[PDB]
Enzyme design. Structure first.
Site, short mmCIF file in Angstrom:
data_model
loop_
_atom_site.label_atom_id
_atom_site.label_comp_id
_atom_site.label_asym_id
_atom_site.label_seq_id
_atom_site.Cartn_x
_atom_site.Cartn_y
_atom_site.Cartn_z
N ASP A 80 0.84 -1.19 0.00
CA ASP A 80 0.00 0.00 0.00
C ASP A 80 0.88 1.24 0.00
O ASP A 80 2.09 1.18 0.21
CB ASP A 80 -0.94 0.00 1.22
CG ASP A 80 -2.15 0.92 1.04
OD1 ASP A 80 -2.38 1.46 -0.07
OD2 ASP A 80 -2.91 1.11 2.01
N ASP A 253 -7.40 -7.97 0.41
CA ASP A 253 -6.35 -8.05 1.42
C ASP A 253 -7.02 -8.52 2.69
O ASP A 253 -8.11 -8.04 3.04
CB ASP A 253 -5.60 -6.73 1.64
CG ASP A 253 -6.48 -5.59 2.07
OD1 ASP A 253 -6.99 -5.62 3.22
OD2 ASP A 253 -6.65 -4.63 1.29
N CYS A 291 -12.05 -29.17 6.59
CA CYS A 291 -10.78 -28.53 6.26
C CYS A 291 -9.68 -29.54 6.03
O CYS A 291 -9.48 -30.46 6.83
CB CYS A 291 -10.38 -27.59 7.40
SG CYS A 291 -8.89 -26.67 7.04
N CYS A 293 -6.46 -28.74 6.02
CA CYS A 293 -5.18 -28.19 6.45
C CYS A 293 -4.48 -29.14 7.43
O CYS A 293 -5.08 -30.08 7.97
CB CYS A 293 -5.36 -26.80 7.06
SG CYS A 293 -5.56 -26.70 8.87
N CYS A 296 -5.94 -29.46 10.99
CA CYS A 296 -7.18 -30.21 11.13
C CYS A 296 -6.98 -31.69 10.84
O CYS A 296 -7.78 -32.51 11.30
CB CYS A 296 -8.26 -29.61 10.23
SG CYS A 296 -8.84 -27.96 10.80
N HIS A 322 -4.44 -22.59 10.39
CA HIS A 322 -5.76 -23.02 9.96
C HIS A 322 -6.52 -21.89 9.26
O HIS A 322 -7.15 -22.09 8.22
CB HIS A 322 -6.59 -23.51 11.14
CG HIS A 322 -8.05 -23.54 10.83
ND1 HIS A 322 -8.62 -24.53 10.06
CD2 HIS A 322 -9.04 -22.66 11.10
CE1 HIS A 322 -9.90 -24.27 9.89
NE2 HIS A 322 -10.18 -23.14 10.50
C1 LIG Z 1 -9.74 -1.66 7.22
N1 LIG Z 1 -10.36 -0.81 6.21
C2 LIG Z 1 -9.69 -0.27 5.20
N2 LIG Z 1 -8.37 -0.43 5.00
C3 LIG Z 1 -8.02 0.34 3.89
C4 LIG Z 1 -6.79 0.62 3.26
C5 LIG Z 1 -5.52 -0.02 3.78
C6 LIG Z 1 -5.15 -1.43 3.09
C7 LIG Z 1 -4.01 -2.14 3.78
C8 LIG Z 1 -2.86 -1.46 4.15
C9 LIG Z 1 -1.83 -2.12 4.81
C10 LIG Z 1 -1.92 -3.47 5.12
C11 LIG Z 1 -0.81 -4.20 5.80
F1 LIG Z 1 -1.21 -4.82 6.93
F2 LIG Z 1 -0.25 -5.13 5.04
F3 LIG Z 1 0.21 -3.41 6.14
C12 LIG Z 1 -3.08 -4.14 4.76
C13 LIG Z 1 -4.11 -3.49 4.10
C14 LIG Z 1 -6.81 1.56 2.23
N3 LIG Z 1 -5.62 1.95 1.62
C15 LIG Z 1 -5.60 2.98 0.71
N4 LIG Z 1 -4.42 3.28 0.16
N5 LIG Z 1 -6.69 3.65 0.35
C16 LIG Z 1 -7.94 3.31 0.87
O1 LIG Z 1 -8.94 3.95 0.52
C17 LIG Z 1 -7.99 2.22 1.84
C18 LIG Z 1 -9.22 1.88 2.44
C19 LIG Z 1 -9.21 0.94 3.47
N6 LIG Z 1 -10.26 0.52 4.30
ZN LIG Z 2 -7.94 -26.50 9.20
#
Ligand SMILES: CNc1nc2c(CCc3ccc(C(F)(F)F)cc3)c3[nH]c(N)nc(=O)c3cc2[nH]1
Ligand SMILES: [Zn+2]
Ligand SMILES: CNc1nc2c(CCc3ccc(C(F)(F)F)cc3)c3[nH]c(N)nc(=O)c3cc2[nH]1
Ligand SMILES: [Zn+2]
Lengths: 356, 356
Positions: A80, A253, A291, A293, A296, A322
């Site tokens: 990100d 993600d 599952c 895995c 399990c 898991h």
């Molecule tokens: C929880 N809700 C949410 N997360 C959001 C994220 C973060 C995505 C992210 C960043 C880092 C990791 C890490 F754990 F791997 F580090 C995992 C996931 C967004 N990121 C951007 N750029 N714009 C958005 O508009 C946006 C909206 C988001 N709603």
């Molecule tokens: Zn499992």
């Protein structure tokens, strides 16, 4: 040799699609779940730009050979752009057209975000955007979205200026516009005019709830180019994934599996369970009956309950293994059901059982 | 089909021995390290009698099929008799000739300890003894040792009364007598008159220090039957293991690897290291240069440092896997060097490098 980036759609059912992204470091099967790296296996993992830029720093990661060498993972990595986490976690922030300053104090701009992701060496790079807070008025949602689109162009230009990045990585643009159809359309149009390898739906999973999220996806995803991948950021629960795929999303993600694994929650086809609860103390069944895995195949709910209640690290590690395996079985079932023309039935069956 | 219990000595160098214990569930190569179960691989693991008798209770473990089924381990398991941990950990205790009462309140006696270990299903059962506190006067050490020998006879009789136990498990007696040669001799004589499958040296690793521990081992181990295994309880560091093998010990319980793994300490042939220290933040070498374990084949000190500093469970799991593997390489090198007649040289080389 694989291309820098090529998305192909192999089968469709309604708005749902299944296919592949080919990149130099590997093939990504879609719909895809992308777990955190520090956690049918995953085809791509997430790096943590915000953490890495502070410890040990992006320069230091480059000095150590880049993130692939550092974490021993030679397949694709997505990062990100960092602003979401800065705004969520850091103590003081100062926003301007240049970027965001935050607390040693730091500035993050489109140009700096792209350079950090370059030093980390990630394969899928996110544009530097502003995740509009929820709720937002139409005027504030519009001003925010307009800034994000100016920042999307600066992100494009910075990425294209670095040969190693432009030739070997891919860049995704992020749609904003809060819950408003006209702003989501303007944002989609701006991003398509700039041109990106893939398109994310940003600004959701920020407190709006599933009904509202699905309503916004209903009109937002068709605005993006059909022939490019669609990434819904920040989502989510298994039922959110199924509904988002029904609405045309290709990539997710998934922090929740690792978060749940360290906090006593296991995912099953019959819904989540809290393994610390005393009702599992004599339960000889595995975490999930179906599952495949390794946990399990070998160990019982009763033993995992014992370990977690005892504070043993082994317990959280088994729960996390898991949970990751559950998510990759979920995504495989989704891909197979779309390819076979039975995804609509799968979604209905999934919901009847998960919520029973 | 293997016997209930058979110890054979294959090679000797000085007081050091190497060989095998054959039991129904497997062969144990000696000298052996015995890690905790809840953590060239280990041939036997330790169950935690004190914890299990409280959560979920020994009856409940039996209802779930015994400890082998419960923890998914079908090879030998050793259990302690519980009194050491009661006296170390529980809040209030009341001692008598019958046993020890402690806080729901509980009584642990020779008969109850043997029955608990029977319900758990362990393969090597320890007699119920009193680990004399250190320091102790001659009079208090003698009174304590005499009670332990009366308790050793009651342990023998209780074990022999349970057919499934007498026919399938083995019983070890525990020598006491603090640091006094005459009491260690009386204790050895009492235990040999009762007769056990193996003999432990108890009452050490209780604050006396390595010099004093080795002094007591110098005269205590030769008092035990030569043709039976010798288990030093509560030990210990790699250098303690090497010196104890030089003095005739065959078996060791090794909590430290798992404890160290969760607290930032890794064992290496050049001594222990504290992976959280900043000097490892850019160190691309594995935890140990020679280690064949899966962690050291794949990941760097710098990455494990990053994970542990970040609070990631993965970091402690990788440290623990390495530490266990280090201990089983240590024991394999000891067994091979005795069998080859070069253990004296190994011990000298080991110390020069571990302490350099
Ligand atoms: C929880 N809700 C949410 N997360 C959001 C994220 C973060 C995505 C992210 C960043 C880092 C990791 C890490 F754990 F791997 F580090 C995992 C996931 C967004 N990121 C951007 N750029 N714009 C958005 O508009 C946006 C909206 C988001 N709603
Ligand atoms: Zn499992
Ligand atoms: C640390 N020093 C020490 N530990 C000693 C122990 C405990 C052995 C044990 C118990 C449970 C576990 C578990 F973690 F697996 F649960 C691991 C190891 C002794 N035990 C008895 N019975 N007599 C002794 O005289 C004696 C002396 C001991 N000195
Ligand atoms: Zn190693």
């Amino acid at each position: 040799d694989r291309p820098r980036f090529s998305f192909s759609i192999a089968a469709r059912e309604g708005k749902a699609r299944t296919g592949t992204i080919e990149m130099k470091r590997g093939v990504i099967r879609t719909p895809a779940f992308m777990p955190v790296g520090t956690a049918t296996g995953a085809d791509i993992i997430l790096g943590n730009t915000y953490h890495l830029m502070l410890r040990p720093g992006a320069e230091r990661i480059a000095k150590l050979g880049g993130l692939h060498s550092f974490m021993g993972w030679d397949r694709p990595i997505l990062t990100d752009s960092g602003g979401y986490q800065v705004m969520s976690l850091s103590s003081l922030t100062k926003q301007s057209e240049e970027g965001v300053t935050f607390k040693s104090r730091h500035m993050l701009s489109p140009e700096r975000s792209i350079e950090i992701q370059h030093l980390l060496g990630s394969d899928i790079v996110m544009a530097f955007d502003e995740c509009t807070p929820y709720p937002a008025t139409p005027s504030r949602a519009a001003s925010s979205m307009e800034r994000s689109m100016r920042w999307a162009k600066r992100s494009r230009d910075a990425f294209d200026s670095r040969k190693e990045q432009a030739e070997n990585a891919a860049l995704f643009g992020i749609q904003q516009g809060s819950v408003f159809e006209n702003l989501r359309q303007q944002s989609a149009d701006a991003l398509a005019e700039i041109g990106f390898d893939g398109y994310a739906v940003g600004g959701l999973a920020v407190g709006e709830g599933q009904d509202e999220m699905f309503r916004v996806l209903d009109f937002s995803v068709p605005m993006l180019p059909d022939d490019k991948p669609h990434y819904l950021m920040g989502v989510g629960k298994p039922d959110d994934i199924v509904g988002a795929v029904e609405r045309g999303i290709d990539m997710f993600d998934c922090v929740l599996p690792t978060r749940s694994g360290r906090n006593g929650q296991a995912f099953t086809w019959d819904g989540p369970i809290n393994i610390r609860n005393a009702r599992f103390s004599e339960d000889l069944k595995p975490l999930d009956s179906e599952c495949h895995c390794a946990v399990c195949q070998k160990w019982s709910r009763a033993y995992i309950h014992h370990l977690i209640r005892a504070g043993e690290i082994l317990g959280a590690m088994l729960m996390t293994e898991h949970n990751i395996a559950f998510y990759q079985q979920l995504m495989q079932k989704i891909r197979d059901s779309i390819s076979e023309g039975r995804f609509s039935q799968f979604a209905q069956d999934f919901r009847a059982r998960y919520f029973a």
